[PDB]
Design an enzyme around this catalytic site. Structure first.
Site, mmCIF file in Angstrom:
data_model
loop_
_atom_site.group_PDB
_atom_site.id
_atom_site.type_symbol
_atom_site.label_atom_id
_atom_site.label_comp_id
_atom_site.label_asym_id
_atom_site.label_seq_id
_atom_site.Cartn_x
_atom_site.Cartn_y
_atom_site.Cartn_z
ATOM 1 N N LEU A 17 30.846 53.494 79.448
ATOM 2 C CA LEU A 17 31.550 53.152 80.674
ATOM 3 C C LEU A 17 33.043 53.195 80.412
ATOM 4 O O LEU A 17 33.795 53.783 81.180
ATOM 5 C CB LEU A 17 31.160 51.750 81.139
ATOM 6 C CG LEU A 17 29.778 51.535 81.741
ATOM 7 C CD1 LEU A 17 29.650 50.097 82.077
ATOM 8 C CD2 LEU A 17 29.570 52.392 83.002
ATOM 9 N N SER A 21 38.648 46.089 75.170
ATOM 10 C CA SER A 21 39.357 45.412 74.095
ATOM 11 C C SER A 21 38.407 45.166 72.924
ATOM 12 O O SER A 21 37.307 44.631 73.109
ATOM 13 C CB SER A 21 39.916 44.088 74.596
ATOM 14 O OG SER A 21 40.559 44.276 75.839
ATOM 15 N N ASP A 133 46.471 37.579 78.904
ATOM 16 C CA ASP A 133 46.776 38.921 79.377
ATOM 17 C C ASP A 133 46.172 39.178 80.772
ATOM 18 O O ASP A 133 45.531 40.194 81.030
ATOM 19 C CB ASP A 133 46.267 39.942 78.354
ATOM 20 C CG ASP A 133 46.837 41.316 78.578
ATOM 21 O OD1 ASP A 133 47.821 41.434 79.345
ATOM 22 O OD2 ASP A 133 46.297 42.277 77.995
ATOM 23 N N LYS A 135 45.934 40.354 84.350
ATOM 24 C CA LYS A 135 46.508 41.496 85.054
ATOM 25 C C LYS A 135 45.422 42.133 85.942
ATOM 26 O O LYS A 135 44.239 41.773 85.845
ATOM 27 C CB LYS A 135 47.113 42.515 84.073
ATOM 28 C CG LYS A 135 46.186 43.014 82.983
ATOM 29 C CD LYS A 135 46.899 44.014 82.054
ATOM 30 C CE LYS A 135 45.922 44.591 81.053
ATOM 31 N NZ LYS A 135 46.562 45.391 79.968
ATOM 32 N N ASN A 138 42.276 43.673 84.270
ATOM 33 C CA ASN A 138 41.328 42.728 83.695
ATOM 34 C C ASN A 138 40.693 41.865 84.775
ATOM 35 O O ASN A 138 40.157 40.791 84.486
ATOM 36 C CB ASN A 138 42.005 41.836 82.657
ATOM 37 C CG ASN A 138 42.299 42.562 81.369
ATOM 38 O OD1 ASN A 138 41.592 43.495 80.991
ATOM 39 N ND2 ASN A 138 43.342 42.119 80.666
ATOM 40 N N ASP A 154 37.628 39.813 79.719
ATOM 41 C CA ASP A 154 38.495 40.134 78.562
ATOM 42 C C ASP A 154 39.445 39.003 78.109
ATOM 43 O O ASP A 154 40.666 39.089 78.268
ATOM 44 C CB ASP A 154 39.286 41.415 78.862
ATOM 45 C CG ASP A 154 39.837 42.079 77.619
ATOM 46 O OD1 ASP A 154 39.621 41.569 76.497
ATOM 47 O OD2 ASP A 154 40.495 43.133 77.779
ATOM 48 N N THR A 168 51.540 46.694 81.019
ATOM 49 C CA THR A 168 51.271 45.264 80.834
ATOM 50 C C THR A 168 52.545 44.446 81.007
ATOM 51 O O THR A 168 52.490 43.293 81.448
ATOM 52 C CB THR A 168 50.677 44.960 79.434
ATOM 53 O OG1 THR A 168 49.745 45.990 79.068
ATOM 54 C CG2 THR A 168 49.981 43.583 79.425
ATOM 55 N N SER A 407 6.135 36.067 66.531
ATOM 56 C CA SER A 407 4.752 35.790 66.123
ATOM 57 C C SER A 407 3.707 36.369 67.075
ATOM 58 O O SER A 407 2.675 36.874 66.637
ATOM 59 C CB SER A 407 4.527 34.275 66.005
ATOM 60 O OG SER A 407 5.043 33.577 67.128
HETATM 61 C C1 LIG Z 1 36.117 48.600 82.623
HETATM 62 C C2 LIG Z 1 34.755 48.819 81.936
HETATM 63 C C3 LIG Z 1 35.036 49.282 80.514
HETATM 64 N N1 LIG Z 1 34.072 47.514 81.919
HETATM 65 N N2 LIG Z 1 34.426 46.586 81.182
HETATM 66 C C4 LIG Z 1 33.681 45.501 81.372
HETATM 67 C C5 LIG Z 1 33.920 44.208 80.577
HETATM 68 C C6 LIG Z 1 32.840 43.833 79.536
HETATM 69 C C7 LIG Z 1 31.576 44.423 79.566
HETATM 70 C C8 LIG Z 1 30.612 44.076 78.624
HETATM 71 C C9 LIG Z 1 30.897 43.127 77.649
HETATM 72 C C10 LIG Z 1 32.159 42.542 77.618
HETATM 73 C C11 LIG Z 1 32.476 41.594 76.644
HETATM 74 C C12 LIG Z 1 33.727 40.997 76.587
HETATM 75 C C13 LIG Z 1 34.672 41.352 77.530
HETATM 76 C C14 LIG Z 1 34.372 42.304 78.500
HETATM 77 C C15 LIG Z 1 33.115 42.902 78.546
HETATM 78 C C16 LIG Z 1 32.772 45.827 82.385
HETATM 79 C C17 LIG Z 1 31.726 45.221 83.103
HETATM 80 N N3 LIG Z 1 31.339 43.978 82.917
HETATM 81 N N4 LIG Z 1 31.078 45.922 84.049
HETATM 82 C C18 LIG Z 1 31.408 47.170 84.310
HETATM 83 N N5 LIG Z 1 32.393 47.776 83.658
HETATM 84 C C19 LIG Z 1 33.079 47.145 82.704
HETATM 85 CA CA LIG Z 2 6.763 31.635 67.472
#
Ligand SMILES: CC(C)n1nc(Cc2cccc3ccccc23)c2c(N)ncnc21
Ligand SMILES: [Ca+2]
Ligand SMILES: [Ca+2]
Ligand SMILES: [Ca+2]
Length: 426
Positions: A17, A21, A133, A135, A138, A154, A168, A407
């Site tokens: 996708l 970070s 951060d 923004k 995020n 994030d 940023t 199990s």
């Molecule tokens: C912008 C595209 C790269 N994207 N990014 C996310 C954020 C995300 C997804 C999976 C695990 C995470 C763990 C820690 C921080 C963020 C996470 C995300 C999402 N939830 N759903 C769809 N697209 C997503």
């Molecule tokens: Ca068990």
């Protein structure tokens, strides 16, 4: 259980996708339930900044964060090379692209949006987590539907992992240029977001990053651009309080949420249309008030981990309208007024037992973490049909989410599949 990964055994990778970070984010699907999820894959060797014991501890608190405007993490799983943080999948993309499309928003539409950022950030700060951060990139849109919840992503992993490798600079408080963070940096960043929402242009604007950071240095912005004249003084008063230079004089996340301008625009309230929907919520909680204790906790773990947007999208609207103070959780009083309003709209005189004692008696069973509040999952648990909550696929996953050793049978320390199915179908 030798030839089985923990992640690999449960999820198939569909596709990439994005590059998040600390590592890549991918679309994955549960091999039993077919329900799709987002997963961030983080290389252990390269990204680790703490021991695994610290990382699993940190992430566990992040998993227990329960708020409609905060990304929901389901689990952290590992193999010999990577960590896999699995969470809700959102389809609506970044708030940033909404800004580009709409250019800028009415005070109504900007209010509904930023109200959600205030709600999430307030909850974050109550749990002593700063974003660092904040923004538009995020903040993700839950779906493509109109007034969909936004989701803050994030944050929380900043000491756990180490990054390697524009725009940023617009959102950073001045103190952050001094190597300092605290909760008030997020307020600043949210103030900038808001200024951009109502005006379509950042308060500290410039051609390159040197010159952007130079205005952010001085703290100087204004409501000079011609579009600011047809914007109320109340939005201006909020922005001014958020973009205050000294952090100690800057308003909290909670005061952002409680600001008059916020109150005025985001006052969506329950109506006749919601009655049948509200009537469904009642039936399902009404037995949850007198449903078995082992049932009550067992249901909370299923609906919290394995639900989806299209299922709980109705409860999501009802939750919102009961949430009169807009903090993303339901306190004792809001339930009581909601029960009074429910009856009033139906034509039944409130003034068994009173509405007040019924809720008093419900809270201890309903508030299961003892938070003082009814968070989203506690609501969904209680106010959903088990007619749709209980499909074979979900029981199959549930069954395997408790059998730790692998199990085929459960031990007492941890807490047959057919004996499992009958227990849950009471
Ligand atoms: C912008 C595209 C790269 N994207 N990014 C996310 C954020 C995300 C997804 C999976 C695990 C995470 C763990 C820690 C921080 C963020 C996470 C995300 C999402 N939830 N759903 C769809 N697209 C997503
Ligand atoms: Ca068990
Ligand atoms: Ca509330
Ligand atoms: Ca609670």
């Amino acid at each position: 259980l030798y030839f089985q990964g923990t992640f690999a055994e449960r999820y198939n990778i569909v596709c990439m996708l994005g590059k998040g970070s600390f590592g890549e984010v991918l679309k994955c699907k549960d091999r039993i339930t077919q329900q799709e999820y987002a997963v961030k894959v983080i290389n252990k060797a390269s990204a680790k900044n703490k021991d695994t014991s610290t990382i699993l501890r940190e992430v566990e608190l992040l998993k227990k964060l329960d708020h409609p405007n905060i990304m929901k993490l389901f689990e952290i799983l590992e193999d010999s090379s990577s960590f896999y943080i699995v969470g809700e999948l959102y389809t609506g993309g970044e708030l940033f692209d909404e800004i580009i499309k709409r250019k800028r928003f009415s005070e109504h539409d900007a209010a509904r949006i930023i109200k959600q950022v205030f709600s999430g950030i307030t909850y974050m700060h109550k749990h002593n987590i700063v974003h660092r951060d904040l923004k538009p990139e995020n903040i993700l849109l839950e779906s493509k539907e109109k007034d969909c919840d936004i989701k803050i992503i994030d944050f929380g992993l900043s000491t756990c992992f180490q990054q390697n490798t524009i725009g940023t600079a617009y959102y950073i408080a001045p103190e952050v240029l001094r190597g300092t963070y605290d909760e008030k940096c997020d307020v600043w960043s949210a103030g900038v977001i808001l200024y951009i929402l109502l005006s379509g242009t950042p308060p500290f604007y410039g051609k390159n990053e040197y010159d952007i950071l130079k205005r952010v240095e001085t703290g100087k912005y204004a409501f000079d651009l011609p579009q600011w004249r047809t914007i109320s003084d109340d939005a201006k008063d909020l922005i001014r309080k958020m973009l205050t230079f000294h952090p100690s004089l800057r308003i909290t996340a909670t005061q952002c949420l409680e600001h008059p301008w916020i109150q005025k625009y985001s006052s969506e309230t329950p109506t006749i249309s919601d009655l049948p929907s509200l009537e469904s919520a009642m039936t399902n909680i009404r037995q949850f008030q007198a449903e078995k204790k082992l049932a009550q906790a067992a249901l909370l773990y299923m609906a919290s981990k394995l639900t989806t947007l299209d299922e709980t999208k109705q409860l999501t609207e009802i939750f919102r309208k009961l949430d009169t103070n807009n903090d993303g959780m339901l306190d004792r009083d809001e339930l009581v007024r909601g029960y009074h309003e429910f009856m009033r709209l139906k034509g039944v005189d409130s003034n068994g037992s009173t509405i007040e004692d019924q809720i008093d008696s419900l809270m201890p069973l309903l508030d299961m973490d003892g938070s003082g509040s009814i968070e989203y999952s506690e609501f969904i648990a209680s106010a959903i049909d088990r007619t749709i909550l209980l499909s074979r696929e979900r029981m199959e996953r549930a069954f395997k989410m408790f059998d730790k050793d692998g199990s085929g049978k459960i031990s007492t320390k941890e807490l047959d599949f057919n004996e499992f199915v009958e227990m849950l179908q009471n």
